[PDB]
Amino acid sequence: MSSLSRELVFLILQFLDEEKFKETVHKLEQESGFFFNMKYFEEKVHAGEWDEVEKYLSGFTKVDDNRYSMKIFFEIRKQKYLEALDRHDRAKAVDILVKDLKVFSTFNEELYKEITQLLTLENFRENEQLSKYGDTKSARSIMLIELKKLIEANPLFREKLVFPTLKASRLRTLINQSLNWQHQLCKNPRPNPDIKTLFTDHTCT
């Protein structure tokens, strides 16, 4: 069925990667939702590109789909918030707290309140649970290791994390076969058929 076509997406992914269209690859992973690219995900988290991180994730799962995915978003948005506090940008920090973290309040009020109160500290490292957060760089790395595990355990990602392995240019190989099938139907074949396009079937005469 489409499980075959689903495979076609994978062939295209390999092709795109070989032609070095990097952004196109990750847009296709995202929109098709067939393959989650860990290496890319990690790279974007370390870079703190949160908008893209959440965008790429939104191709795979929403915040409330299950407790795994819910914890994933929460961790991301928490780190987002802390970094805002750390550069003393309180305008952004409160913006994050209302837009991003409020959804989690319904399920646990008390944590939301405690997270809110971090706004008023000299340094959120005054909170004993966060007393160990020593770098933007380090926190990201620590949290990243946590995210990998949450993702790998998430039922919605569980069969999406390993790229199938193909010989180089599988799609180019297949395309080539389509040209052989076209020419084998030619009455009067020249042993060297010159193929004008992939756009319409080849013929001889």
């Binding site: 407790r67 989690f104 646990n108 997270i115």
Partner: peptide, 6 residues
């Protein structure tokens, strides 16, 4: 594990 906290 799945617990939401700092």
């Amino acid at each position: 594990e799945l617990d939401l906290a700092l």
